[PDB]
Curated annotation (Swiss-Prot), chains A, B:
It catalyses: (2E)-4-hydroxy-3-methylbut-2-enyl diphosphate + oxidized [flavodoxin] + H2O + 2 H(+) = 2-C-methyl-D-erythritol 2,4-cyclic diphosphate + reduced [flavodoxin]. InterPro entries: Dihydropteroate_synth-like_sf, IspG_bac, IspG_bac-typ, NO2/SO3_Rdtase_4Fe4S_sf. It comes from Thermus thermophilus (strain ATCC 27634 / DSM 579 / HB8). This is 4-hydroxy-3-methylbut-2-en-1-yl diphosphate synthase (flavodoxin). Its cofactor is [4Fe-4S] cluster. Its EC number is 1.17.7.3. Pathway: Isoprenoid biosynthesis; isopentenyl diphosphate biosynthesis via DXP pathway; isopentenyl diphosphate from 1-deoxy-D-xylulose 5-phosphate: step 5/6. Binds 1 [4Fe-4S] cluster. GO terms for biological process: isopentenyl diphosphate biosynthetic process, methylerythritol 4-phosphate pathway; terpenoid biosynthetic process. PANTHER family: 4-HYDROXY-3-METHYLBUT-2-EN-1-YL DIPHOSPHATE SYNTHASE, 4-HYDROXY-3-METHYLBUT-2-EN-1-YL DIPHOSPHATE SYNTHASE (FERREDOXIN), CHLOROPLASTIC.
Amino acid sequence: GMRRPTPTVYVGRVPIGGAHPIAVQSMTNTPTRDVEATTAQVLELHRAGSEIVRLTVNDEEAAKAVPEIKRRLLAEGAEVPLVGDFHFNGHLLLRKYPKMAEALDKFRINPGTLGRGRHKDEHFAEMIRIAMDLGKPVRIGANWGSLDPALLTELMDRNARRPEPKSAHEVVLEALVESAVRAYEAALEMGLGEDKLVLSAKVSKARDLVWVYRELARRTQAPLHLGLTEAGMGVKGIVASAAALAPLLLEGIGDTIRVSLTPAPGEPRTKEVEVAQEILQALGLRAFAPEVTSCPGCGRTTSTFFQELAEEVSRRLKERLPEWRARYPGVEELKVAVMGCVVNGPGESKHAHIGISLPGAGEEPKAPVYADGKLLTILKGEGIAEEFLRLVEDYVKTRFAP
Amino acid sequence: GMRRPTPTVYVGRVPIGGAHPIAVQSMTNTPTRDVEATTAQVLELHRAGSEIVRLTVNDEEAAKAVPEIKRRLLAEGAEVPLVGDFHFNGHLLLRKYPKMAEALDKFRINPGTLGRGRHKDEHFAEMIRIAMDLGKPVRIGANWGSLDPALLTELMDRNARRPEPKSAHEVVLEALVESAVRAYEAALEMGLGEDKLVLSAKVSKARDLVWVYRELARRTQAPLHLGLTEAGMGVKGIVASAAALAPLLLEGIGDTIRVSLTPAPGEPRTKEVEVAQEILQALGLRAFAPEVTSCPGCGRTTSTFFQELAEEVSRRLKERLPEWRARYPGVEELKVAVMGCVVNGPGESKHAHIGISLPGAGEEPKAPVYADGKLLTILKGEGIAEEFLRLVEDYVKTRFAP
Ligand SMILES: C[C+](CO)[C@H](O)COP(=O)(O)OP(=O)(O)O
Ligand SMILES: C[C+](CO)[C@H](O)COP(=O)(O)OP(=O)(O)O
Ligand code: SF4
Ligand code: SF4
């Protein structure tokens, strides 16, 4: 599959663009002024796999905290880049708090939260000037929840002159794209480099997101920050996010992703990082950790042992990963199968690196194990689970040896 | 978006094809011979939204149970169609147990589990003959876990003659498609109607599934049963399934879906139905229930109240749905927003049918509510949650009145 070529934008030490792995990012939900809480959550998110972390810089007390948060991160060798999220008063905060401006690795601007009418262009120019002075990259990030009303009215009037006007909904999507593209072009014209500009234009419906990003990809050369905004809670948020991103990622569009989940009360903020990683890995774009392929089970499946075994294998693989990642380069690509009966068991197992096919209904009580597409052994009796996990360990040591 | 046109195939009373809603299906995991357990699970799945339910018919005792399961379903007015899943001995079971053959609403055949060499064609013909005699529809369902080895060798040899041979992996995908297409054409040639044939060709990797179904859609006219086989457990299974199906559904390919999740020990079998519904609804293809759009929350968000409120609104909407579905036609389309601050709160709320924007950091402690894109009221104090839910109820009564 062919990735859209783009210039490289470094966000701290992390390169993003068409020549680089698609980067996972996230955002904190602690008050930025709370240095201890925010530092801890940045570290938690980074350790979960957030390669870039965003934090809101909403007021003066937030701005004053940012240099200390960065200092603390660096003191433990955590080189995770920080993106500051600015709305309404970004120009004032960046002007008044130069140490915050220098401590951030990237500024996020929203062309719909710059101020009204004439103030907009001036506030934009000031934030871009500061970024240029400090050599910082910028994301120009549009969101349909904060669309520039003057631009919307301009495009509504253009639409009304068409021989067949489009729907109001379609015009909103046009305006969102136009907001991002106009601001991109303005920033380039002011002298901000192509190696310093990332774009997003987010909406909260999957089919609309696909249209928007196809337009952005066509009309601009910038790396794109992709996400389905306001995806919501639980299973709904997870599914909507994956459904929205996949068609675009498969087409080669997108250079960094963020998954916008609402945590349930007491649910960890790291869930969104896990989902982002799973999207990229599902599409074969990155490898973060070994994966288990398993059938759903059906009436052919002999007992609850199948579900238990699949769960145990997944759990063990998670426990071994920190060590394996250190010793066995490439192990993140490991595919393990655990299957319920002979119908698909051998075949699916032979497509994995290693897999086991349990005996289902009507079969002799033995479980063949396949590795690299051929029979490795046949297991029987008690301790199938512990035997198989030993065989997986043995496999990893040989296949992913340095 | 434009749906691929196809003939209509009735599965019991449920029509599938390009002129009809994309149908959600599932499969039982109880032993089919256990009439009480299987009947109960069929009912559970149907009540969760499984429009078609599949059950394995693996042996003689399974076959003998099917008529009683169907009888019990019909006794409670549950007209849910049953698909029988046959492997290895389907021809023997359908021949020996005509009451099972008549009680099923559809037969699933796997061209890779028919038997070896010469036996294959005969077993296929017999199952198709029985379907034709009884006026039953058939799914010819290929799976890469049970690929016909003779066909694979044929295509491996064709590939080896190419000036630039493809990879072994690519040949497997070619063979999977060819298996389904050849069997489709054979069944048509035997006289099975176009209104009696559904096709699937499942693989366990998302990008490969997209290639396969694009080929099936091009080379055949049949309605397509789409699924990512062996998607696995937990978040991984959910994300992979959504990621695989979305690009195809957005392109108009697919007439019925099944989500192939491995339940965790003690996790309900209905989870896969919930995920299938969420995929279709995320893509705007079906509406099953009201949805809540909510931001992730960030450091602008004032307290834990935001996450609590979003959760409470979602919970209330789920509680009201059975009643609402009866009284208020079209309510399944309801979009509700719950947002954390002024940045995107008003704008996202104005895109929903009704939404609330909480006050975040720096804002006065008041929460505007929007409905049909304009200000409805402004809430303050305690009981915001109960006030908003009353306003949502009031909205539904007026907007979705019969
Ligand atoms: C953080 C923010 C400002 O527009 C949001 O409200 C939601 O976060 P998000 O879904 O990642 O979308 P943004 O990048 O923030 O537009
Ligand atoms: C049931 C079956 C027979 O091929 C499977 O093993 C898995 O179920 P599935 O993922 O829905 O795939 P199938 O339609 O069954 O091929
Ligand atoms: S591999 Fe066997 S046990 Fe697993 S779902 Fe398929 S037919 Fe059922
Ligand atoms: S709407 Fe406000 S509270 Fe919600 S994530 Fe966005 S900026 Fe943060």
